[PDB]
């Protein structure tokens with residue numbers, strides 16, 4: 001009777017609200033009529049290996065059938081921490097949580113404890129907690145967090161005004177609409193004035209490479225947060241970082257922080273990502289998908305542009321165009337996430353990619369025939385900016401011809 005209060009919100013599979021998903025296996029989910037759909041949501045990117053991965057499933061099932069209680073499997077817990085710490089440069093300790101929001105709030109709390117300072121600066125989305133609620137540039141939210149929307153000019157403003165008062169800056173990286181060098185510059189500006197940095201890798205950690213995405217962008221951070229990439233859909237997250245920041249998290253423990261099934265899933269997941277060369281293969285397979293998708297769009301003269309590549313790409317279009325693309329893709333058995341990147345898994349390889357392209361080709365054909373008025377429409381700068389803001393929760397640099405004031409006005413109007 002709408003008794004659940006937080007069902008409406010940022011849940012995946014909104015495009016499929018008119019259908020009923022009952023099964024998942026590999027690259028596919030299946031509806032109640034037995035129809036298979038290629039899944040590019042993958043529980044908002046939490047499923048990096050594929051649904052019902054055989055190795056993850058056997059590890060979980062063995063742990064469930066042992067009945068071993070929480071916090072008794074010390075070797076497994078420490079092994080997982082060693083796996084995570086060993087993929088980061090430096091000497092990290094690891095504190096485990098159950099959601100990405102818990103991990104980012106804990107990292108912020110650790111910075112506050114060490115520095116004795118309160119204010120936090122932020123780029124991107126860090127979770128549902130009120131401390132991560134977006135407010136206009138220069139306006140601290142109810143928990144003393146300032147939002148900079150990935151603009152170096154807005155970072156500079158906060159640093160020029162509060163750098164001596166900042167406990168930390170927390171940046172969720174993204175590379176679809178900006179370069180690795182652009183992201184690195186955001187971190188470096190804060191580093192140069194001595195501000196603690198948190199790389200929020202909840203989305204991209206273990207997706208783009210076997211470790212933190214920022215490492216390949218020539219960035220090091222004081223703490224890193226992970227969740228989606230590490231556990232194939234099981235509820236586990238962490239803060240990994242330098243000892244001086246991880247020591248204040250010693251008592252950040254819940255009754256079920258160490259429930260065994262999720263640790264078994266995560267340790268198996270990290271091993272399988274390495275064994276199957278997942279991120280490097282996705283870079284190849286996703287690049288092929290995005291190139292061929294772009295060609296299909298072009299021959300059909302539809303107002304869509306592909307952005308990104310590999311494991312993180314996006315169908316850039318106006319909202320009213322996306323609202324046609326998504327149902328038409330669903331009708332052809334292809335689940336796309338709206339107003340975001342797509343999230344292919346390790347099973348998005350081989351014949352699955354060709355299957356997805358065939359379904360997209362059919363969807364583009366029906367879309368052009370159902371909505372001939374969209375054929376030949378141009379994609380505008382505003383379309384591109386809107387799509388970036390939806391995807392990365394910030395601006396992809398100051399758009400051409402926009403003043404900083406226009407950027408601030410635009411972001412304010414999105415809230």
Ligand SMILES: Cc1ncc(COP(=O)(O)O)c(CN)c1O
Nearest residue numbers: 099100101125126127172202203
């Ligand atoms: C970049 C990033 N940071 C943190 C979070 C919050 O994590 P969670 O949804 O697991 O609470 C999310 C959403 N998963 C995210 O995309």
Ligand SMILES: [Cl-]
Nearest residue numbers: 026027028347
């Ligand atoms: Cl599959």
Ligand SMILES: [Cl-]
Nearest residue numbers: 097098099102
């Ligand atoms: Cl939690």
Ligand SMILES: [Cl-]
Nearest residue numbers: 151152397398
């Ligand atoms: Cl800029």
